[PDB]
Write a protein that binds this DNA or RNA. Structure first.
Ligand SMILES: [Zn+2]
Lengths: 50, 130, 77, 101, 151, 49
RNA sequence: UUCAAAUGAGAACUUUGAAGACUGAAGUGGGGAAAGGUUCCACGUCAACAGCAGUUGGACGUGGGUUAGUCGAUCCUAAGA
RNA sequence: AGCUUAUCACCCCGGAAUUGGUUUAUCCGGAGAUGGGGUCUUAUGGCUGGAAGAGGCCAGCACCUUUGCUGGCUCCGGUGC
RNA sequence: GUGAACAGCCUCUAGUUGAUAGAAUAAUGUAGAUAAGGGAAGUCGGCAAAAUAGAUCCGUAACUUCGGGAUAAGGAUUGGCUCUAAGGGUCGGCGAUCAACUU
């Protein structure tokens, strides 16, 4: 999984060109963080309300 | 490519450290090459000949600057141990082991400190004359 | 643009009869390095120049505001 | 001395974060005059449950605190959803990003 | 559609080049409706157009190499490629040295460690050489004063 | 240029006001021989000195 | 040079985004003089032109746009007329 | 814009060999040096006014707006053939 | 940034990604590159190519209008890492303190 993380970040980064966008300004879906936090082992009953 | 091809030609071939070992081994060999009568063709007219780096310099000061250098120390640090003959090459493969081991203990006992003392006499001779 | 030290000349300027407008500015400043305090800048708009008075002590500043003439328009902040 | 104050209400309420693990990370990974294990009378990390608090007589800065907190969030896989921000001077807090449905 | 004018205007508003500014491809009609810098500003603040922070140029390697140079590395004959003069002029060296020697003698004369006549001969001797540095000048001064009081 | 004289600018203004196609209500006229503007000008094709 | 989407009857060539590269401060940058003269900008827009293509264009059709007591000319004289 | 600030230059005192002062570069001095005090040009810099109210960096909050409004920070330094 | 350097190489800001495309990889060409042993037997002719090349040190002939020739020629070296020494300024009646790259 460490090697998989490295391989993912290799594609994700591309840093010598264009300065990865900040997350302050972007917006993400709901469902994505559902999957992420379920995989991490949390539950989303406090977020579904919201 | 060009560098290896044009440096390591058999025309420009140098003098095979085995033989430099066999030469620095004994007294008469080193004194002969320190004496080296006047030859019109040799670079330094004979004299000023380094034996480790089998090379004729022009002058005493060119010998000094050669000895105060890493090109000399490369060779002296290469020539300390045994000289890697075909005996070693075949003893590694399982062939004439006892000959190799006799040669090894012979160098360790007899020939090693012989050559070391010869090198030390050479060094203080050169440092005193230069 | 010009600074003033005296008070009498600021009053004369307020009563110069070519002044229509003034303005008070409040700044928060630190003294030496040390303590917050309230600087006040009384600016008056002449025809050619803008005259200004720097008052560090608010007590004297508000008494200056009182002694200002009444017809003169003033602008706060 | 110098005091710094982090708030952790937002993630802790929705159940992604535990301040005790965050303080357990800080109290060991904070460096003084070199490496870990020199917080002798100089630094005090203490939690309440909603607010973590640091008090330091030694060299310590809000950028260092942010660096440590972002490292912890990357450890627990929270960098891509939470940000450490300043609300007032030396008063910081964790906040979710602008995720909308 | 064609958001060329919008990219240009967003660059001119934000104060960067077009290579930075970013248009979310989902809000295409909302961006194409815009034909004014006020509208572009609205789209800047609402989060439809952002700034794309700077492409980095780090100096960790340069600072490390400079630190090794301070420590006395990467300076040998294989790294030297210009003459000693081009690297450091002897005129500059002599200027430093002579200013130093003049300043020292001035301070000694003003303090009273030395008289104006010995100052005068030392000035011209240091204008010439035979005083290689502060140490040699101080030692010569000490020898002079010692033989003087000996006389 | 950009520091023109008024003579040059006046000639330029005449050229701008001339730089048009032909109106359509002239096609519809009794005994109309004209079908295009043969004295039309473009900055890249011909120069007007 | 490439990938997806959008537009469109139609996309190797247009737009956006995602990548990879280039000019590398004696620039493929930012401004000016001479010359040019609206080529600037917008809206529509493809018959002809852009030695392939074209939904694009310095093209085609219609409009908008150049604000000075302080920048310049204007004034002075130079070689000269 | 106000106050202050300089190399050269100049003024008063005084009268110099045991010749002294001095530039990286050797010139200056009884036609008055060194030294002590002072005067001037104010290019140039420093403080203040202009001026933080501007601009910049962040944080928000309306979310129904084709302009919606608040809060914080904007400090102190260092170095060179 | 390297480096003596506005050289050459890479990069930041800003800008561009324009020059008809696709599939194969025959000869002959255009632009380059390598080659055993021999080394100018080639050719009108060493054309062209190769070799040399920067910096430190040693050393440098005839001739000379005494100014040069001269980088004559010909030789020893060059990395990295850890160290030593020397080279300065400001204050205190030798010390405290600060700082740069040159050997
Ligand atoms: Zn040798």
């Amino acid at each position: 999984r460490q090697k998989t993380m490295i391989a993912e970040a290799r594609n994700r980064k591309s840093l010598k060109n264009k300065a990865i966008m900040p997350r302050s300004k972007l917006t993400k879906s709901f469902g994505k963080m559902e999957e992420h936090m379920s995989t991490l082992g949390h539950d989303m009953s406090a977020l579904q309300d919201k | 490519g060009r560098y290896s091809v044009k440096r390591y030609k058999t025309k420009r071939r140098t003098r095979d450290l085995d033989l430099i070992y066999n030469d620095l081994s004994t007294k008469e060999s080193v004194q002969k090459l320190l004496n080296q009568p006047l030859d019109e063709t040799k670079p330094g007219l004979g004299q000023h000949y380094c034996i480790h780096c089998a090379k004729y310099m022009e002058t005493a000061i060119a010998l000094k600057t050669h000895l105060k250098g890493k090109v000399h120390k490369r060779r002296v640090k290469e020539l300390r141990g045994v000289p890697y003959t075909q005996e070693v090459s075949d003893a590694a493969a399982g062939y004439n082991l006892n000959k190799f081991l006799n040669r090894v203990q012979e160098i360790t006992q007899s020939v090693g400190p012989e050559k070391e003392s010869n090198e030390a006499l050479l060094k203080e001779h050169l440092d005193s004359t230069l | 643009a010009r600074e003033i030290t005296d008070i009498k000349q600021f009053l004369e300027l307020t009563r110069r009869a070519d002044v229509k407008t003034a303005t008070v500015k409040i700044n928060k400043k630190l003294n030496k390095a040390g303590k917050p305090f309230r600087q006040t800048k009384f600016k008056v708009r002449g025809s050619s120049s803008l005259y200004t008075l720097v008052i560090n002590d608010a007590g004297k500043a508000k008494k200056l505001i009182q002694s200002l003439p009444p017809t003169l328009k003033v602008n706060r902040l | 001395a110098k005091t710094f104050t982090v708030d952790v209400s937002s993630p802790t309420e929705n159940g992604v974060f535990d301040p005790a693990s965050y303080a357990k990370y800080l109290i060991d990974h904070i460096k003084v005059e070199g490496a870990v294990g020199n917080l002798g009378n100089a630094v005090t990390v203490t939690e309440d449950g909603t607010v973590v608090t640091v008090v330091s007589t030694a060299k310590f800065s809000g950028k260092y605190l942010k660096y440590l907190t972002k490292k912890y969030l990357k450890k627990n896989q929270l960098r891509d959803w939470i940000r450490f921000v300043s609300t007032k001077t030396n008063e910081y807090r964790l906040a979710f990003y602008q995720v909308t449905p | 559609a064609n958001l060329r004018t919008q990219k240009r205007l967003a660059a001119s508003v934000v104060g960067v080049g077009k290579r930075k500014v970013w248009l979310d491809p989902n809000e295409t009609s909302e961006i194409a409706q815009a034909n004014s810098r006020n509208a572009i500003r609205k789209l800047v603040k609402n989060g439809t157009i952002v700034k794309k922070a700077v492409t980095v140029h780090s100096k960790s390697r340069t600072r490390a190499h400079a630190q090794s140079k301070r420590e006395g590395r990467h300076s040998g004959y294989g790294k030297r490629k210009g003459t000693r003069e081009a690297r450091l002029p002897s005129q500059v060296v002599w200027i430093r040295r002579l200013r130093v020697l003049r300043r020292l003698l001035a301070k000694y004369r003003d303090a009273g460690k030395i008289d104006k006549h010995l100052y005068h001969v030392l000035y011209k001797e240091s204008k010439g050489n035979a005083f290689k540095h502060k140490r040699a000048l101080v030692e010569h001064i000490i020898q002079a004063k010692a033989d003087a009081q000996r006389e | 240029a950009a520091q023109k004289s008024f003579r040059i600018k006046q000639k330029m203004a005449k050229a701008k006001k001339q730089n048009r196609p032909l109106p359509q209500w002239i096609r519809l006229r009794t005994n109309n021989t004209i079908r295009y503007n043969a004295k039309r000008r473009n900055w890249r094709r011909t120069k007007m000195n």
